[PDB]
RNA sequence: GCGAUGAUCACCCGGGUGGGUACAAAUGGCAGUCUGACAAGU
RNA sequence: GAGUCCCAUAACCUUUGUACCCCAGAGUGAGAAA
RNA sequence: GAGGAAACUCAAAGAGUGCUAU
């Protein structure tokens, strides 16, 4: 029913941000909506993280239309403010995307969260 | 039409032997006989790619 | 005399062509715009004016049940739109939407009305400025010929050979330069008399009609005291009809 | 390369309703139901024909799996002029519009999708294409929209789920003709990521066979996509032997 | 053990009676399967006993919803009651959907529903021959009713509304400018036409719309009265002094008098120009109102017309929302909609148009509250640079 | 009292050349206004 | 005797004039200000 | 030997399709 849907629980958000925070260290993370919009059309994104408390939430509801048209998993999470802290940038982030690389050191972690994400959807 | 306008005649002659046109390209091997039905048409660009492919 | 100025013919014909283009453009617009509310009408009724008149009579598919389209459409056409109305795929529209689109239908019919008014006005002008040609070649063709030259005197100075191929310059000059074959009919093909002819007789009457057209024109253009009657055109029209009758009478096939 | 003001020689393809636009490069091209616009920004051809200005649309394989399937050299494509087609997984008009192009005004396309957000666009595209009926509905329960569907001569499925095979069976059983066409796009990762793709590809084939579908062809969609194939079959109720 | 079959058609419900029951043991043998294809054999299996068309388009949708949910409608209840005999034992009825079975059983305890493959094969056969089985009964044409009904069933659950519709913006834009060229083209023709009769006046009143009205009043230059001078003086204002000039120039001019038939065309043609300007101003206001309803944030942020043009380039408000900020910038970079420091505001403002499109596009009923503050943010940046 | 709801990012001597988009004009160019005695019937 | 039927009511090129332009494009992606 | 043109012409066959073929 809510526009921000599906929204990850306290637990599933946990492994997501862990992937996000490390992925920033590995230069595998594109941060913010326009980069999220960027990656979807180029089809280099594993899955997209969105903040459910975004002001206004509709500023990012375009991304799921792009995401599921390209059959890319996506999800919502409660607090934007936490995501930036994971993302490593000194400002809130409302949207983030993990870029495609089968040579990344974290292919198992990303795929692990990806599988859970698909079940959630 | 049987008139087979010369500009169309050469044009079909520039795509039968298209391999020699640019030394870096090197297409597949295909004989490409003339067909008995064809038309010449213009691709058209869209507004977003004004810069890249216009 | 204010009734004998050809600069009005050249403007009217130019305006007449412009009205046809713009009237056609808006016709597609009401087709697509109301096509939203009821896409199926365009396939049934092709006429733009008839399409618009339906919109004025009935606005919404619900009205099709009770509205009568007899005056606009014949019996088999009007029933088809009624069946299409209730089974239509289109979505409902607001009255504010309805009002604007109805004004377009009013806009379409008014220009359809004016276009005929301009057509009648043009006919009256030619029958005063060049009565004989209107008798021989006709109104629509004659104005286009005069407009091509730019003046009655200029076309009156065009020999019948050029009048014959007045509107085929590109194929003419192209063909002349490439040592290939040349036009015959020019702008005159849309005249009536060339129409009734068949086969190669088309070319013959074109030559004969052009020769008489010059005869009629040089009388129309330069005659100091021309009576606005078209007598020279009428008698010339008689000759070409006689020329056509004997020409078409001939049968190549052996009987 | 395929730049606007340039011209190309458009010619028929082996599959009726498909064309090749030749030039410095070639393009898979299909004639436009709806001249004057692009559904997803694709490239378009315009030809003057006695004069009417007929338009064509370029087909991008990297966006549509079916187009890539043609290009891999699919022998039989049941989608053709004057044939009813059931497209499962109608995310948007990216592929459906092109399929609608192939069937023509006489034919129709029965587009099926579940989610609401893409359906709104599918509805918008489907309107401009009168031959398209957008059935935004779950494909896992064809009985819901049996009311809206008759016979379809070919069923194409781009639905991305683990349980595709059962979905194909029901829709084929209810609506597909005998000896009708079936075209399935299979993504290995979506079904079973634990095992290699090639194993999934055989496993799905057997699911088709027990569903009374004699599969005819399978083509990997290299290089346009990784770990994918189009499987083409015939629905032979009488006997697959 | 099947005696009656229920089939639902977009025109209405159809009930059939099974004269002969096909073999169940060899149900999958090729010859019996070929029979389902064969009309001649199939007609022997069943016959049409009753058909109840829906009264109108609406009834089909509600039943289409009810059948989707496995619910028995009043229309379905009536047809079954009329046909199914009372029953010690239970009359057997074939239904495609199992979920509908319990609903039928609740209403009619005396009927047992069958949905096994044997029923499915018969349902497959019925849906195959379609109108051929109706034996000339008026069933319309099944294909169109599917198109319309399926069209209706789709928007219902997604809750599509005319309010979301933004095409009316796109068409009116191309209509607004299309009107603009034509009024200019036609008005200039009026000047040439009346220019012959009174060439000086065309110079006096450069505004074409004013000129058409003045020609409508001043049909003939010869008619010059003090009261007429006041009347044309009322037209526009005497500050320019044209009211005195027209009387003076009309008295002394080289314009050749035109025929009465000519004059009738000039004013009537000028009347046509006036109507288009009259409609053009009407449509322009409609564009303003529709934009405020559809995309309030864009309208407030940049302006109704400018926001309208942007939507046209993207092809739809949904298209504009999907595009990235950079793409939105180059979308309006050909007509300078958004227009080194000058460029920075353009890049800056383009982003605010992009986010505003997102707010309008996906909100069922967008407001202008965000557009106001977003524009205010641009104003702060404008002052800063 | 900033920021991922997004920061940052051709030539010559203040001046002149080079190039690009759109519209209007040219009585500027292409560009030169078909042929000419026969035809049809017995 | 002889292609109206590819708008000489026109297309294209040249000159002049008017108004604007000299950013990336599948744009980059964390600095800026001090 | 290879061909071409004409048809409310005359034949010899093949395939598919349609129409209550009950």
CSV table of C-alpha atoms in Angstrom, one decimal, chain D residues 34-228:
chain,number,residue,atom,x,y,z
D,34,UNK,CA,2.2,4.5,-35.0
D,35,UNK,CA,4.3,6.8,-37.2
D,36,UNK,CA,5.7,10.1,-35.8
D,37,UNK,CA,7.0,9.0,-32.5
D,38,UNK,CA,9.2,6.5,-30.6
D,39,UNK,CA,7.9,4.4,-27.7
D,40,UNK,CA,11.3,4.2,-25.8
D,41,UNK,CA,13.5,6.6,-27.9
D,42,UNK,CA,14.4,4.0,-30.5
D,43,UNK,CA,15.7,5.0,-33.9
D,44,UNK,CA,13.3,5.3,-36.7
D,45,UNK,CA,13.3,5.2,-40.6
D,46,UNK,CA,11.2,7.4,-42.8
D,47,UNK,CA,10.6,6.5,-46.5
D,48,UNK,CA,8.5,8.4,-49.1
D,49,UNK,CA,6.3,6.0,-50.9
D,50,UNK,CA,3.6,6.9,-53.5
D,51,UNK,CA,3.5,10.5,-51.7
D,52,UNK,CA,2.9,9.0,-48.2
D,53,UNK,CA,5.7,9.1,-45.7
D,54,UNK,CA,5.8,5.5,-44.2
D,55,UNK,CA,7.9,5.1,-41.1
D,56,UNK,CA,9.9,2.2,-39.6
D,57,UNK,CA,11.4,1.6,-36.1
D,58,UNK,CA,14.8,0.3,-35.3
D,59,UNK,CA,14.9,-2.7,-33.0
D,60,UNK,CA,17.7,-2.8,-30.3
D,61,UNK,CA,18.7,-6.4,-29.4
D,62,UNK,CA,20.4,-5.4,-26.2
D,63,UNK,CA,17.0,-4.1,-25.0
D,64,UNK,CA,14.7,-6.8,-26.4
D,65,UNK,CA,15.6,-10.4,-26.0
D,66,UNK,CA,13.4,-11.5,-29.0
D,67,UNK,CA,15.3,-9.2,-31.4
D,68,UNK,CA,18.6,-10.7,-30.2
D,69,UNK,CA,16.9,-14.1,-30.8
D,70,UNK,CA,16.3,-13.2,-34.4
D,71,UNK,CA,19.9,-12.1,-34.7
D,72,UNK,CA,21.3,-15.3,-33.3
D,73,UNK,CA,19.5,-16.9,-36.2
D,74,UNK,CA,16.2,-18.3,-35.0
D,75,UNK,CA,14.9,-20.6,-37.7
D,76,UNK,CA,11.2,-20.3,-36.8
D,77,UNK,CA,9.4,-17.3,-35.3
D,78,UNK,CA,5.7,-18.0,-35.1
D,79,UNK,CA,5.0,-14.3,-34.5
D,80,UNK,CA,4.1,-13.1,-38.0
D,81,UNK,CA,1.5,-11.1,-39.9
D,82,UNK,CA,-2.1,-11.8,-39.1
D,83,UNK,CA,-1.5,-13.9,-36.0
D,84,UNK,CA,-2.7,-13.7,-32.4
D,85,UNK,CA,0.2,-13.4,-29.9
D,86,UNK,CA,0.1,-13.7,-26.1
D,87,UNK,CA,3.1,-11.8,-24.6
D,88,UNK,CA,3.6,-12.7,-21.0
D,89,UNK,CA,5.7,-10.3,-18.9
D,90,UNK,CA,4.6,-7.0,-20.5
D,91,UNK,CA,6.8,-4.7,-18.4
D,92,UNK,CA,6.5,-1.9,-21.0
D,93,UNK,CA,6.3,-1.4,-24.8
D,94,UNK,CA,10.0,-1.9,-25.3
D,95,UNK,CA,9.4,-5.2,-26.9
D,96,UNK,CA,5.6,-5.3,-27.1
D,97,UNK,CA,5.4,-2.4,-29.6
D,98,UNK,CA,7.8,-4.2,-31.9
D,99,UNK,CA,5.8,-7.4,-31.5
D,100,UNK,CA,2.7,-5.3,-32.3
D,101,UNK,CA,4.6,-4.1,-35.3
D,102,UNK,CA,5.2,-7.6,-36.6
D,103,UNK,CA,1.6,-8.9,-36.2
D,104,UNK,CA,0.2,-5.9,-38.1
D,105,UNK,CA,-3.3,-4.3,-38.0
D,106,UNK,CA,-5.0,-7.6,-38.7
D,107,UNK,CA,-3.2,-9.4,-35.9
D,108,UNK,CA,-3.4,-8.6,-32.2
D,109,UNK,CA,-1.1,-8.8,-29.2
D,110,UNK,CA,-2.3,-10.0,-25.8
D,111,UNK,CA,0.1,-8.3,-23.3
D,112,UNK,CA,0.2,-9.6,-19.8
D,113,UNK,CA,1.8,-7.9,-16.8
D,114,UNK,CA,1.5,-7.9,-13.0
D,115,UNK,CA,2.9,-4.7,-11.5
D,116,UNK,CA,0.9,-1.5,-11.7
D,117,UNK,CA,3.6,1.1,-12.3
D,118,UNK,CA,4.8,-0.4,-15.6
D,119,UNK,CA,1.2,-1.2,-16.6
D,120,UNK,CA,0.3,2.5,-16.7
D,121,UNK,CA,2.9,3.0,-19.4
D,122,UNK,CA,1.8,-0.2,-21.1
D,123,UNK,CA,-1.7,1.1,-21.1
D,124,UNK,CA,-0.5,4.4,-22.5
D,125,UNK,CA,1.5,2.7,-25.3
D,126,UNK,CA,-1.2,0.0,-25.8
D,127,UNK,CA,-3.8,2.7,-26.6
D,128,UNK,CA,-1.8,4.3,-29.4
D,129,UNK,CA,-1.6,0.7,-30.8
D,130,UNK,CA,-5.2,-0.5,-31.3
D,131,UNK,CA,-4.1,-4.1,-31.9
D,132,UNK,CA,-2.7,-4.3,-28.3
D,133,UNK,CA,-4.9,-5.1,-25.3
D,134,UNK,CA,-3.0,-4.6,-22.0
D,135,UNK,CA,-4.0,-7.3,-19.6
D,136,UNK,CA,-2.4,-6.0,-16.4
D,137,UNK,CA,-2.8,-9.2,-14.3
D,138,UNK,CA,-1.0,-12.1,-12.7
D,139,UNK,CA,0.0,-14.7,-15.2
D,140,UNK,CA,0.1,-17.4,-12.5
D,141,UNK,CA,-3.7,-17.5,-12.5
D,142,UNK,CA,-4.9,-17.4,-16.1
D,143,UNK,CA,-8.5,-18.1,-14.9
D,144,UNK,CA,-8.6,-14.5,-13.7
D,145,UNK,CA,-8.3,-13.1,-17.3
D,146,UNK,CA,-9.7,-16.1,-19.2
D,147,UNK,CA,-12.7,-13.8,-19.7
D,148,UNK,CA,-10.5,-11.4,-21.7
D,149,UNK,CA,-8.6,-13.9,-23.9
D,150,UNK,CA,-9.5,-16.2,-26.8
D,151,UNK,CA,-7.2,-18.3,-29.0
D,152,UNK,CA,-3.7,-17.1,-29.5
D,153,UNK,CA,-1.5,-18.7,-32.1
D,154,UNK,CA,1.8,-18.0,-30.4
D,155,UNK,CA,2.6,-17.4,-26.7
D,156,UNK,CA,5.8,-15.5,-25.9
D,157,UNK,CA,7.0,-15.3,-22.3
D,158,UNK,CA,9.6,-12.8,-20.9
D,159,UNK,CA,8.4,-13.4,-17.4
D,160,UNK,CA,11.3,-13.6,-14.9
D,161,UNK,CA,10.4,-16.0,-12.1
D,162,UNK,CA,11.6,-19.3,-10.8
D,163,UNK,CA,8.3,-21.0,-11.6
D,164,UNK,CA,8.0,-20.0,-15.3
D,165,UNK,CA,7.3,-23.5,-16.6
D,166,UNK,CA,4.0,-23.9,-14.8
D,167,UNK,CA,2.9,-20.4,-15.9
D,168,UNK,CA,3.6,-21.4,-19.6
D,169,UNK,CA,1.6,-24.6,-19.2
D,170,UNK,CA,-1.6,-23.0,-17.9
D,171,UNK,CA,-1.6,-20.2,-20.4
D,172,UNK,CA,-0.8,-22.6,-23.3
D,173,UNK,CA,-3.5,-25.1,-22.1
D,174,UNK,CA,-6.2,-22.5,-21.9
D,175,UNK,CA,-5.5,-20.2,-24.9
D,176,UNK,CA,-2.9,-21.6,-27.3
D,177,UNK,CA,-4.1,-23.5,-30.4
D,178,UNK,CA,-3.1,-27.0,-31.1
D,179,UNK,CA,0.2,-27.1,-32.9
D,180,UNK,CA,0.6,-23.5,-31.7
D,181,UNK,CA,3.7,-21.5,-31.1
D,182,UNK,CA,5.6,-21.1,-27.8
D,183,UNK,CA,8.7,-18.9,-27.3
D,184,UNK,CA,10.3,-18.8,-23.9
D,185,UNK,CA,13.2,-16.7,-22.7
D,186,UNK,CA,15.0,-18.4,-19.8
D,187,UNK,CA,17.3,-16.6,-17.4
D,188,UNK,CA,19.4,-19.1,-15.4
D,189,UNK,CA,20.2,-16.8,-12.5
D,190,UNK,CA,16.5,-16.1,-11.7
D,191,UNK,CA,15.5,-19.8,-11.6
D,192,UNK,CA,18.5,-21.5,-10.0
D,193,UNK,CA,21.7,-19.5,-9.2
D,194,UNK,CA,23.2,-22.4,-7.3
D,195,UNK,CA,23.8,-24.5,-10.4
D,196,UNK,CA,25.3,-23.5,-13.7
D,197,UNK,CA,23.0,-22.0,-16.3
D,198,UNK,CA,23.4,-24.8,-18.7
D,199,UNK,CA,21.9,-27.3,-16.3
D,200,UNK,CA,18.8,-25.1,-15.8
D,201,UNK,CA,18.5,-24.9,-19.6
D,202,UNK,CA,18.1,-28.6,-19.9
D,203,UNK,CA,15.9,-28.8,-16.8
D,204,UNK,CA,13.4,-26.3,-18.2
D,205,UNK,CA,13.3,-28.2,-21.5
D,206,UNK,CA,12.1,-31.3,-19.7
D,207,UNK,CA,9.4,-29.3,-18.0
D,208,UNK,CA,8.2,-28.2,-21.4
D,209,UNK,CA,8.2,-31.8,-22.6
D,210,UNK,CA,6.0,-33.1,-19.8
D,211,UNK,CA,3.8,-30.1,-20.4
D,212,UNK,CA,3.0,-31.5,-23.9
D,213,UNK,CA,5.3,-28.9,-25.6
D,214,UNK,CA,7.6,-30.5,-28.1
D,215,UNK,CA,10.4,-27.9,-28.0
D,216,UNK,CA,11.9,-27.2,-31.5
D,217,UNK,CA,14.9,-24.9,-31.0
D,218,UNK,CA,17.1,-23.3,-28.4
D,219,UNK,CA,19.5,-20.4,-29.0
D,220,UNK,CA,21.8,-18.7,-26.6
D,221,UNK,CA,21.5,-15.0,-26.7
D,222,UNK,CA,25.2,-14.3,-26.8
D,223,UNK,CA,26.5,-11.6,-27.1
D,224,UNK,CA,23.5,-9.4,-26.4
D,225,UNK,CA,22.9,-11.1,-23.0
D,226,UNK,CA,24.7,-13.5,-20.7
D,227,UNK,CA,23.2,-16.8,-19.4
D,228,UNK,CA,20.1,-16.6,-21.6
